[PDB]
Design a binder for this molecule. Structure first.
Ligand SMILES: CC1=C(/C=C/C(C)=C/C=C/C(C)=C/CO)C(C)(C)CCC1
Ligand SMILES: CC1=C(/C=C/C(C)=C/C=C/C(C)=C/CO)C(C)(C)CCC1
Lengths: 171, 118, 114, 113, 124, 180
């Protein structure tokens, strides 16, 4: 661990990362997060504000299941990577908040890697974050990517600490 | 037996277990100063909050954390917490039962004990 | 206009849209009779159930279809439906307002008489 | 004391003592047939209604005469009685307690399975 | 033309009801407060309920910024003038607001001498 | 007590009874009832319906005094005396019912009785009741009328008990004084 200094995506480039992305893995943050059929649509508005509208199913209240429609606004910070997000369910009862939202790596067209620890363990870079594995096409990623998304999960800390997400029509 | 608070989950129709509960009693200076606190058992009830000769006439406020409870279910709530202010008069009856019914965007509350004394 | 019927969601804090409502009037024979039907709108409300002239005295029973509202949500209730039995224009035409705040396990019904 | 029914006044912030309660079990012919009954005690509860093995999964209904209760109190109510419909599924938990909060013009109920 | 202009669709709206007479609570005091930058409650919006049991225009869109607010309803007054010694000194609602964008809130309170319930109708 | 053993006003004319009537003595029928400052007001209406709309102060709900504003319609019968009044509160929460409402005598000019049993004894005839003792001037009746309104409370199974029907400029509105 050590959240800071995790050297994140380089000369990031919002726009070029404004396509569509799909889930593929996941880190389990503490609490109730999204569940499956986790897609996200990255937009952008003249102003330079990099938005991103996720789509997903979460185990809300004991049984009941809801395909929750989410939204999120991103507010710049040094590194072109990092960001500050304030998401919110187009609909109430949907966990609103702010979370770190780096972008650890991504060729834009194929794979990417997003990290986000929101509390830090006693002075000492992080203590409980959630990470997503995104890829252009919902099928998988070539041999190259995977060999990187794999050699990051080590840098970013996590190796195997994931759990691939299905996507059975539901949202 | 002194002031038995009790919670109820309306969505789940069960007892609000592990709900935090802080009670305050207006001080001279018009400020609230901690009186007792705890958590709702497995039944959703709160007992052992004070005693007959410590629980004196005055103005009391009861504060219950619903938000926590809710986010712990995963639903975003409306409120920030539910509050209950009330005159504890030596007036007659002194058995107080404080109940709440919580749902994501609303909560009610009742009190009991009458004045059995002609 | 006289009668009205409001319904609201106590989980999404939002009106209770498209909620069937069935009204019945105790007949001469201690037997409930269909008297009105309809569904809440986009604003939780259900207008034009009856006319004053038509609206006569007698016990009326509003029956709210909560159970499929809740189920269509993807949540299982504990109540089959809500019931509200009262007497009307017992001592002169009044304009009723029935409100209902629904929870999966707990609802409630108020009544504003003007 | 399963299937314990309770009642509360919101107006006298006190227990609805002596509140007639009648329960009904929807029969095969879609008809309601008496199941058990009584009145709320000094504390506003009414237990000893049934038994684990009498109480089977099905559809019963809890009738609350409230007007007779405001009627003693010199208050002429809006409601005719506070009814209750729900199905009893072994599904899992079988400890049922349907409370009620009474006022001359509004009333709320809840359960705790 | 003027600067700072927009629609007039009441963002906020309080509504009080009478559990004992089945009527809307009319002439009930309602003071509103906004947590300060220093954990201090500041006065926000005052007003009494109409013949309707409704309090309109307590604030404006522009003036309603996100943060926490309060809505105190002095039930104590209502019941006493009537001739009833209530249990609660008053009814308090504390919530955040326009947290994720502006939204139209409606706080309704049903009144009863020893009980009172509150709900919020809000929509995007 | 018991019933049908006594009379009621003969060809009583509702139109010559119409005028204000001041309570003075009551009866204690089971359950809450009309307090003090009990004042009538009996109207008619072409058809013939003999109305009435008496105000009063009631002990309602423990310790919450409210000056109740009633109203009651009347429906004929066989002996012009007895009627069939269904009473209701200009306002809800006000015990509304239907009681038998005779008129055990009078002289539509200060001092008219009234009776009403809504429960009959083991087929004996009369259990509970309630009764009022009217007169048109709130200061008391002549030595004659109170002679009769003292004869008719022994011919009237259970006519006049006279609890403290206390008049005292009470239900004012200009300064609430005590209520709403
Ligand atoms: C806004 C947003 C982010 C996170 C959304 C979250 C964290 C939604 C959480 C929803 C909660 C759990 C709902 C609770 O009912 C992701 C990273 C997808 C990227 C772009 C969109
Ligand atoms: C209508 C009416 C009759 C009785 C009214 C009663 C019996 C009112 C009871 C009021 C209740 C007790 C109020 C409870 O809040 C009297 C005989 C005066 C004659 C004409 C008016």
């Amino acid at each position: 661990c050590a959240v800071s200094s995790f050297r994140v995506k380089e000369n990031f480039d919002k726009a070029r990362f404004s396509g569509t992305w799909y889930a593929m893995a996941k880190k389990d943050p503490e609490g109730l997060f999204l569940q499956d059929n986790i897609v996200a649509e990255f937009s952008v508005d003249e102003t330079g504000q990099m938005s991103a509208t996720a789509k997903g199913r979460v185990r809300l209240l004991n049984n009941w299941d809801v395909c929750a429609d989410m939204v999120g606004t991103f507010t710049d910070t040094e590194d072109p990577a990092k960001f500050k997000m304030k998401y919110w369910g187009v609909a109430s009862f949907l966990q609103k908040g702010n979370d770190d939202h780096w972008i650890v790596d991504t060729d834009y067209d194929t794979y990417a890697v997003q990290y986000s620890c929101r509390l830090l363990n006693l002075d000492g870079t992080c203590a409980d974050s959630y990470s997503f594995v995104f890829s252009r096409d919902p099928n998988g990623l070539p041999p190259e990517a995977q060999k990187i998304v794999a050699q990051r999960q080590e840098e970013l800390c996590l190796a195997a600490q994931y759990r691939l997400i299905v996507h059975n029509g539901y949202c | 037996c002194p002031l038995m608070v009790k919670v109820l989950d309306a969505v789940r129709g069960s007892p609000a277990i592990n709900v935090a509960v802080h009670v305050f009693r207006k001080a001279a200076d018009d400020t609230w100063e901690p009186f007792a606190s705890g958590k709702t058992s497995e039944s959703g009830e709160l007992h052992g909050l004070t005693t007959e000769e410590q629980f004196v006439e005055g103005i009391y406020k009861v504060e219950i954390d619903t938000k926590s409870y809710w986010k712990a279910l995963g639903i975003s709530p409306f409120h920030e917490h539910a509050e209950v202010v009330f005159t504890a008069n030596d007036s007659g009856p002194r058995r107080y039962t404080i109940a709440a019914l919580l749902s994501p965007y609303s909560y009610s509350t009742t009190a009991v004990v009458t004045n059995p004394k002609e």
